[PDB]
Amino acid sequence: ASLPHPKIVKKHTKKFKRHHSDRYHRVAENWRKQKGIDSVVRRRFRGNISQPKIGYGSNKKTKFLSPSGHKTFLVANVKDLETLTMHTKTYAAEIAHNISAKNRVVILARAKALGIKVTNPKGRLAL
Amino acid sequence: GIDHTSKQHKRSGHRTAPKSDNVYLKLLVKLYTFLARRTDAPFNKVVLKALFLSKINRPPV
Amino acid sequence: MAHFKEYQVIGRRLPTESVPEPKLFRMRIFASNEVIAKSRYWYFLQKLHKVKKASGEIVSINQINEAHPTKVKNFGVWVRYDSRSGTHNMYKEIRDVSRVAAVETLYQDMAARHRARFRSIHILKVAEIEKTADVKRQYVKQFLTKDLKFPLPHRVQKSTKTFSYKRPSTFY
Amino acid sequence: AESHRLYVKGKHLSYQRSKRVNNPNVSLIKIEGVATPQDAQFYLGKRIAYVYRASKEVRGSKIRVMWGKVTRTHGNSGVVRATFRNNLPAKTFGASVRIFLYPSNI
Amino acid sequence: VEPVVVIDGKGHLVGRLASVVAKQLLNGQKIVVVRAEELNISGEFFRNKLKYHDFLRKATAFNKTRGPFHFRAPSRIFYKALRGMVSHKTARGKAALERLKVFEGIPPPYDKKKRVVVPQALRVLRLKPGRKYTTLGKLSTSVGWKYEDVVAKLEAKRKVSSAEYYAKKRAFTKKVASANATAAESDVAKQLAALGY
Amino acid sequence: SHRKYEAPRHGHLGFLPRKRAASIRARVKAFPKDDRSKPVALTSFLGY
RNA sequence: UUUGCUCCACACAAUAUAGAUGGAUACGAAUAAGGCGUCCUUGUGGCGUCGCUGAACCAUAGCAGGCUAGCAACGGUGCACUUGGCGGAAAGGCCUUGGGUGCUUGCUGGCGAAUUGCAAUGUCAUUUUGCGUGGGGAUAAAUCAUUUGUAUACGACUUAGA
RNA sequence: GCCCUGAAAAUGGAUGGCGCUCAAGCGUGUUACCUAUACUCUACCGUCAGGGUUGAUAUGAUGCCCUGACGAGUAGGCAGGCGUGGAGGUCAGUGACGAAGCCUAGACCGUAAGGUCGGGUCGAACGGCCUCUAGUGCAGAUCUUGGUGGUAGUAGCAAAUA
RNA sequence: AGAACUGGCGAUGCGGGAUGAACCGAACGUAGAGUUAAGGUGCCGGAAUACACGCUCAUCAGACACCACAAAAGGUGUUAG
RNA sequence: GAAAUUGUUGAAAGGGAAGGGCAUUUGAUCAGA
Ligand SMILES: [K+]
Ligand SMILES: [Mg+2]
Ligand SMILES: [Mg+2]
Ligand SMILES: [Mg+2]
Ligand SMILES: [Mg+2]
Ligand SMILES: [Mg+2]
Ligand SMILES: [Mg+2]
Ligand SMILES: [Mg+2]
Ligand SMILES: [Mg+2]
Ligand SMILES: [Mg+2]
Ligand SMILES: [Mg+2]
Ligand SMILES: [Mg+2]
Ligand SMILES: [Mg+2]
Ligand SMILES: [Mg+2]
Ligand SMILES: [Mg+2]
Ligand SMILES: [Mg+2]
Ligand SMILES: [Mg+2]
Ligand SMILES: [Mg+2]
Ligand SMILES: [Mg+2]
Ligand SMILES: [Mg+2]
Ligand SMILES: [Mg+2]
Ligand SMILES: [Mg+2]
Ligand SMILES: [Mg+2]
Ligand SMILES: [Mg+2]
Ligand SMILES: [Mg+2]
Ligand SMILES: [Mg+2]
Ligand SMILES: [Mg+2]
Ligand SMILES: [Mg+2]
Ligand SMILES: [Mg+2]
Ligand SMILES: [Mg+2]
Ligand SMILES: [Mg+2]
Ligand SMILES: [Mg+2]
Numbered sequence A: 001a002s003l004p005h006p007k008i009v010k011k012h013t014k015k016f017k018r019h020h021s022d023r024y025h026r027v028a029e030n031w032r033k034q035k036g037i038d039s040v041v042r043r044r045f046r047g048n049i050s051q052p053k054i055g056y057g058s059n060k061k062t063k064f065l066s067p068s069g070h071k072t073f074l075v076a077n078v079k080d081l082e083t084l085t086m087h088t089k090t091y092a093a094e095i096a097h098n099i100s101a102k103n104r105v106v107i108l109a110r111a112k113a114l115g116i117k118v119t120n121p122k123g124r125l126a127l
Numbered sequence B: 001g002i003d004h005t006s007k008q009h010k011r012s013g014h015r016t017a018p019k020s021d022n023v024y025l026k027l028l029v030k031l032y033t034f035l036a037r038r039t040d041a042p043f044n045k046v047v048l049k050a051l052f053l054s055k056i057n058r059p060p061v
Numbered sequence C: 001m002a003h004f005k006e007y008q009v010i011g012r013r014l015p016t017e018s019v020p021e022p023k024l025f026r027m028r029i030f031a032s033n034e035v036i037a038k039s040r041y042w043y044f045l046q047k048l049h050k051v052k053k054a055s056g057e058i059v060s061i062n063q064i065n066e067a068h069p070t071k072v073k074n075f076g077v078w079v080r081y082d083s084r085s086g087t088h089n090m091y092k093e094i095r096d097v098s099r100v101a102a103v104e105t106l107y108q109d110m111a112a113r114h115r116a117r118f119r120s121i122h123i124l125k126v127a128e129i130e131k132t133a134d135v136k137r138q139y140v141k142q143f144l145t146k147d148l149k150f151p152l153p154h155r156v157q158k159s160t161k162t163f164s165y166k167r168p169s170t171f172y
Numbered sequence D: 001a002e003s004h005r006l007y008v009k010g011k012h013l014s015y016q017r018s019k020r021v022n023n024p025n026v027s028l029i030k031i032e033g034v035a036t037p038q039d040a041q042f043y044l045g046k047r048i049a050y051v052y053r054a055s056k057e058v059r060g061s062k063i064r065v066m067w068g069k070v071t072r073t074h075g076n077s078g079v080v081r082a083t084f085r086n087n088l089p090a091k092t093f094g095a096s097v098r099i100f101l102y103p104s105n106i
Numbered sequence E: 001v002e003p004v005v006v007i008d009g010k011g012h013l014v015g016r017l018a019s020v021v022a023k024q025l026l027n028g029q030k031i032v033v034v035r036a037e038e039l040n041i042s043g044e045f046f047r048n049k050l051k052y053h054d055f056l057r058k059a060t061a062f063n064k065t066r067g068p069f070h071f072r073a074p075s076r077i078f079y080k081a082l083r084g085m086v087s088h089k090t091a092r093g094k095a096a097l098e099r100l101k102v103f104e105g106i107p108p109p110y111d112k113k114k115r116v117v118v119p120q121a122l123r124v125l126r127l128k129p130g131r132k133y134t135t136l137g138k139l140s141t142s143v144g145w146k147y148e149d150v151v152a153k154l155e156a157k158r159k160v161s162s163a164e165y166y167a168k169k170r171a172f173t174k175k176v177a178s179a180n181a182t183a184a185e186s187d188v189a190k191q192l193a194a195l196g197y
Numbered sequence F: 001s002h003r004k005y006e007a008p009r010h011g012h013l014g015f016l017p018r019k020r021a022a023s024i025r026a027r028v029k030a031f032p033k034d035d036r037s038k039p040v041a042l043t044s045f046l047g048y
Numbered sequence G: 001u002u003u004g005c006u007c008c009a010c011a012c013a014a015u016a017u018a019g020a021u022g023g024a025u026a027c028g029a030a031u032a033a034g035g036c037g038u039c040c041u042u043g044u045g046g047c048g049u050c051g052c053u054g055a056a057c058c059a060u061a062g063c064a065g066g067c068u069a070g071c072a073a074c075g076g077u078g079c080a081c082u083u084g085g086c087g088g089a090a091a092g093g094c095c096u097u098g099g100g101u102g103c104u105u106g107c108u109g110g111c112g113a114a115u116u117g118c119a120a121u122g123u124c125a126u127u128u129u130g131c132g133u134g135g136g137g138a139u140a141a142a143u144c145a146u147u148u149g150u151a152u153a154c155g156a157c158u159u160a161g162a
Numbered sequence H: 001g002c003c004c005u006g007a008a009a010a011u012g013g014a015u016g017g018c019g020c021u022c023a024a025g026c027g028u029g030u031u032a033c034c035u036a037u038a039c040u041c042u043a044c045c046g047u048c049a050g051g052g053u054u055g056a057u058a059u060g061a062u063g064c065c066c067u068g069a070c071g072a073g074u075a076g077g078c079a080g081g082c083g084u085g086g087a088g089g090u091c092a093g094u095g096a097c098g099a100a101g102c103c104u105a106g107a108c109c110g111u112a113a114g115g116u117c118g119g120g121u122c123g124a125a126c127g128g129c130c131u132c133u134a135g136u137g138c139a140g141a142u143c144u145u146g147g148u149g150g151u152a153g154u155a156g157c158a159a160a161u162a
Numbered sequence I: 001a002g003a004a005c006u007g008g009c010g011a012u013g014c015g016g017g018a019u020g021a022a023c024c025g026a027a028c029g030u031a032g033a034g035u036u037a038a039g040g041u042g043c044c045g046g047a048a049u050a051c052a053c054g055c056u057c058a059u060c061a062g063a064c065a066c067c068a069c070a071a072a073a074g075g076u077g078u079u080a081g
Numbered sequence J: 001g002a003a004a005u006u007g008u009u010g011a012a013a014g015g016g017a018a019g020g021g022c023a024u025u026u027g028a029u030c031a032g033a
Helices: A078-084 A101-114 B023-039 B042-051 C034-048 C099-114 D037-043 E012-026 E045-056 E074-083 E091-098 E136-142 E148-181 E189-192
Strands: A073-074 A091-095 C006-009 C025-031 C060-062 C074-082 C088-095 C122-130 D008-015 D023-029 D047-058 D061-072 D079-084 D094-100 E004-008 E030-034 E039-043 E100-102 E133-136
Touching: A073 A078, A078 A091, A078 A101, A091 A101, B023 B042, B042 E100, C006 C034, C006 C099, C006 D023, C006 E100, C025 C034, C025 C099, C034 C060, C074 C099, C074 E074, C088 C099, D023 D061, D023 D094, D037 D079, D047 D079, E004 E012, E004 E074, E012 E030, E012 E039, E012 E074, E012 E091, E045 E133, E045 E136, E074 E100, E074 E136, E133 E136, E136 E148
Parallel strands: A073 A091, E004 E030, E030 E100
Antiparallel strands: C006 C025, C006 C060, C074 C088, C074 C122, D008 D023, D008 D094, D023 D079, D047 D061, D047 D094, D061 D079, E039 E133
């Protein structure tokens, strides 16, 4: 349903977790670069965690592409959704987290009419 | 490994666009970029380079 | 150094205007290739005459093949070698089919018995002993007796497999 | 007949490795009856299956297969290098693998 | 090539045999070693006894029950030589060692099975003639192994029974060699010989 | 530095550990060497 | 014992597999010596022969091996019985008697196979456990509490109590 | 030359260990083989450099595209970005049909700072973009305040006759 | 402890030297394949219990530079002069 | 109504720490088409 693309290659799917974020609770997992003079991670000794670097950058042709092959576009209403009317093979609409259930029903109906893919069609559905 | 004889990733050290955000100066830069690229006249290239110059490098005449 | 070949190397001590056609000195050098043969030639020429590679030239390098490579010969070899504490001259006798094989055996034997590396050995002379009873080393004389036969006791056959099912025998 | 085998027996020895660093992407296989790289050249390119069993039935069987192939000879004693679609688990060091006769050139 | 390989350790150069067995174990072959008391070590008996006493003097100073254990039996001496060459602290090394059994003599499970030898570890094939060597049973007895006499008596009994079995087998083999001695000039035999059988 | 005065160690290291015996009846750990020409007889007795 | 325990047979479920995919195929001893066969005056004997690896030997054909017709010969092999012996180092195996029964590819036939679609381990093994159905067998202890003091910080130990 | 004597230190221990004796030792020679983030080729990311392309539907000329080379890094410099409180503009943005917050080995995007979504809880506000602004980002400072552990049901609650 | 030149460590990961800031090799974006360096190929441990010539038996053998020591003097031990 | 810390339930592992990196087996779970 999306534009043809090369095989999507992720050079590093594992998250870059901050050093010792598994050792101390106060050290969050959000990546921080070690600045210590003796840091084994900064010095890149074998057996330690890898650090984010530009070499891991994804192919520009497949960058930002979801597994379906679309780029995610956040939509808050029908006017936001309709910006993808001529771009249904490249963009997929994602309804914003704070959209009410009835507005989600309206947006889903409009996206179905316009052939726009919705990444989260089951949010705030009838239970 | 390569025994580099010069600094790697060295920027040219010359301006390639004005530091100014003047839209009209940018339009002039575009016009003289086109002229310098597609005329082969040294005047157009030197004018294009002069359009990049800072204020202290463009003393009043 | 390696499996040896013998080369004749003739060098010149490059001519000048006063002395054209210099005396064309020659050596028989055992070496594994021609680069090493020429290097050894220049080394010994610098040991013998006032000349160096820059002031001379190599006129000819030619491999000398064994005249009778399939005739068993006794060779007498005069060598000079540097030990850890001095320099010594030795005479040894080697039974082989060629000068190159005898010289390889000589280098192996000097390395084994005197820890003499290639760099420490000078081959003074290699000459075939034409007449037996001029062989003066018993370890070669014992191989010149009439109708020499000897067994090879305790034969050890190499197994192609890790395990054997027969408790093998060393008969021969 | 009593025998039905159409593969050569082999043993997963280890991964490709240096003294202290291994490479799980390449496995070393000892093929029965192969003692030289000249012999192993015959088995170059042959498909290999590691066949193992699981408790959970998946797609109509409790037997699962990891497929790979011989890529090149290894060493002087007939060991071969092999690459698999998924690397072997490394609990299979010493486990038996099957080297099939296809793709065949006889 | 067999599910279990039974090596007759007699005269087998304990270190080289241990190398062979360790490689087989790590490659996944089940090995049973019999007659460990008849293994050999190169070097004089006094040399190897002094080596064992140097091993014996090594022990944890503050508690000898923690230090290296000095097993006296020949099978355990071989097992030590083999464990020092298997990565025994890993799960893989533990599995490889579980694939191994070492015995003094030939116990009843294996006295009726084929025993193989390892030529690359055989003393007669490896040691230069005239070099002195030690016998593992004698060394073990000298360093405290208690069962040389019992193993010797049971080995003598087993050899008697095995000699009777082999006399019967040799008689049957003579009968078979007679049976295929005839029927060797038949057309089937000539065709088999033409095909190499 | 050295003990500065020699004295024998206290206690016998061959009676270790100084633990409770596993049973109230001490085990006979060695019986007399068998002399197979003698009549059959007990080698020990139990008393209180 | 809210019908308990154990063993056997079968069925059904799980459960995993340090890793089956024809056979672990048994003298001992020596190795500057032996194995085998044969003969005699029986030995540390004579003669012959062998090794130079198991690259062997056995086994091996049949819808993963079907259904049938014969020929030849009383052989081979499996199964469940059965006679007896031997084996204690961890024996738990080895040998053997008799009959029954299935197969026999030792030889000659007849029928079947297909479409798993050009390959996909294409599932054939053994490890425990549970449950149900039948049959066989048996009908206790330990600990707490009390007590003892040959014991003991507490546990523990040693005793006694229908 | 090798070997041996010369050759004595304190926990038990080190050719790394095992072990190795025509070596798995020593001297020497020849091949084969193993493997670094090194070399060669290719792909992708970024940087730098040299260029092509306003002739339009071309709305991204700081855009698109072509070519080559390069990539270690403390102290440090610079650049491009992520996030927070508040401010101007804008999306006539989101929201009691549920804002913010919080929880969530659930999903997606980014090399990353981070962003987005689903589910639960919840109850009244909040966000995207273009800019402005700062009391704007914590793992440490025997940091400050508050809260909470292991220690640990532990030390112990034994002077003053009961 | 103090100078000279250079190369390094600091600031540097990687393969080897078991282990180690400096040694050897080689300097590093993310991957694939091939080939190697220094070092290795009995087993641990990937790689020949390879080939060839000799030497050594040690009742404290010996086993790779930096480096983790050994000397003078001796030995019908053995080998070659 | 966070975290530290704690109880219960569920899952998993556990021969003198635990935690981590590469790779895959197994179990659980799940997106995209
Ligand atoms: K944390
Ligand atoms: Mg990612
Ligand atoms: Mg530092
Ligand atoms: Mg580079
Ligand atoms: Mg004792
Ligand atoms: Mg004293
Ligand atoms: Mg010494
Ligand atoms: Mg080695
Ligand atoms: Mg050598
Ligand atoms: Mg690379
Ligand atoms: Mg440019
Ligand atoms: Mg950099
Ligand atoms: Mg503020
Ligand atoms: Mg909410
Ligand atoms: Mg959590
Ligand atoms: Mg309210
Ligand atoms: Mg502040
Ligand atoms: Mg804090
Ligand atoms: Mg800090
Ligand atoms: Mg503090
Ligand atoms: Mg505080
Ligand atoms: Mg208390
Ligand atoms: Mg008190
Ligand atoms: Mg009181
Ligand atoms: Mg500093
Ligand atoms: Mg460096
Ligand atoms: Mg070292
Ligand atoms: Mg190996
Ligand atoms: Mg001396
Ligand atoms: Mg509340
Ligand atoms: Mg909590
Ligand atoms: Mg414990």
